A = this chain, B = another copy of it.
């Protein structure tokens, strides 16, 4: 529309001629336009730190369960009828034992997907992205040089995990295993461009099986390494030995493995595929994963048996069953809002309003709405403290999906020299205390988060004003979602996950 540009294309061509597409992964100085502005030292920001990795730290859940009408208890009955009665299984276990076995197999498979993602990341190098692979190895909690120096041992340990897992049987058509394996074994770009931001999913903990004999059967948390840990292969081997120590000597699990093998055949079982030296993972583009990560809503740290929570004596996360308690129901009723410290993280008050679910476009198909709400978990009531002096504030949900988000971990480069990698972990809620080195740090945090495209929505609590700000995101087509609607969607998605269609019903 400017006729001068077509009459002089050469002048326009040598006029612009700009660099365009700097490799991300390293610090970039912009320099000064006013050269005398070194007298205003910190008042001129010449830094440019583009982040690369946001790791979503999750816990695998069987859904919320406090009575026999839970989807996990209905699934326990539905799979026990197929294994025990429709296929003539053994009679030395109940339905809750079979479902606890089926839940421990999931933690086994998530560990396998985790270590093979560690394997496949360490072979990713490109000139356009200097975060590959080291920042992604840091976000998973390993020593990035151990996987380089001991690559063959890692590569054979992953295969040995997959071979040892063949000692147990678990149905393949149960979509719980497929969803957890697809979720914890993927690199996801946020934009589908050349040098995009990477999303990952790491387990915060796994579920460790514990036998109690007469007084039931537990699943306790086994903590996974966090992003600053620098764990070697020996640590992951000790973790895998700790995960299967209570499972290979158990005769109940041997009987249940034989029964699931007999009921579902050999081709109807979960098979962990073997990897080789040429096995590469590539970061794909998936708009459903991004629709999960946007509106993912973090619950906080898992509560442990050794965690000090004043006013909440026994409230550790555990999937329990007892034939005396709740007439043999599988019970997972966890408290949320814990952050690892014996105080109140009072930014969790910002999660006490109704959530916003915004999606791309205007279509909003039914399975798109059921997929975008998987990691969203709203609180319903406060937990009641046991006593008179309570330091934290714990919350009870209105149900949740098969995964809850514990927190997020963002890997970026440092603004100051020597520009190392920076690890910041955060909830959806972020408290900004009244100190000088909190406001510009939170602003760096916010600008690093908005580099990620379908990021989680942030809730910023300022302690100076005693005021939280609501959903810090750009909204396109949103709904205000209440707790009963999200509870209905959660019950649907958890019922679909534990459904086993290999049972030949008409249905």
A128 sits at the interface (CB 8 A): yes
Complex contact B353–A45 (CB within 8 A)? yes
Shortest distance between the CB of A375 and any CB in chain B (Å): 16
Shortest distance between the CB of A297 and any CB in chain B (Å): 10
Shortest distance between the CB of A240 and any CB in chain B (Å): 10
Which residues of B lie under 8 Å from residue A460 when comparing CB positions?
443
A35 sits at the interface (CB 8 A): yes
What is the oligomeric copy number? 5
Complex contact A17–B15 (CB within 8 A)? no
Complex contact B3–A488 (CB within 8 A)? no
A3-B499, A128-B11 given; A465·B488 CB < 8 A: no
Which residues of B lie under 8 Å from residue A131 when comparing CB positions?
24-25, 52-53
Complex contact A44–B350 (CB within 8 A)? yes
Shortest distance between the CB of A143 and any CB in chain B (Å): 8
A80 sits at the interface (CB 8 A): yes
Shortest beta-carbon contacts, A-B, top 9: A25-B130, A45-B470, A52-B131, A42-B467, A4-B496, A37-B352, A34-B352, A16-B369, A152-B156
- From A130, which residue of chain B is reached at the shortest CB distance? B25
A242 sits at the interface (CB 8 A): no
- From A260, which residue of chain B is reached at the shortest CB distance? B127
The 5 sampled A-B contact pairs (Cβ below 8 Å) are: A7-B507, A21-B477, A32-B352, A33-B379, A194-B362
Shortest distance between the CB of A185 and any CB in chain B (Å): 14
Range class of the A interface residue count: 35 or more
A68-B134, A127-B260, A467-B45 given; A34·B444 CB < 8 A: no
A322 sits at the interface (CB 8 A): no
Which residues of B lie under 8 Å from residue A367 when comparing CB positions?
2, 5, 12
Which residues of B lie under 8 Å from residue A437 when comparing CB positions?
465
Complex contact B42–A169 (CB within 8 A)? no
A395 sits at the interface (CB 8 A): yes
Which residues of B lie under 8 Å from residue A359 when comparing CB positions?
20
Complex contact A94–B33 (CB within 8 A)? no
Complex contact B18–A369 (CB within 8 A)? yes
A21-B477, A489-B16 given; A349·B43 CB < 8 A: yes
Shortest distance between the CB of A20 and any CB in chain B (Å): 5
- Mask for A416-460, Cβ within 8 A of B = 1, else 0? 000000000000000010001101100110110011010000011
- From A24, which residue of chain B is reached at the shortest CB distance? B129
A155-B152, A156-B151, A496-B4 given; A355·B33 CB < 8 A: yes
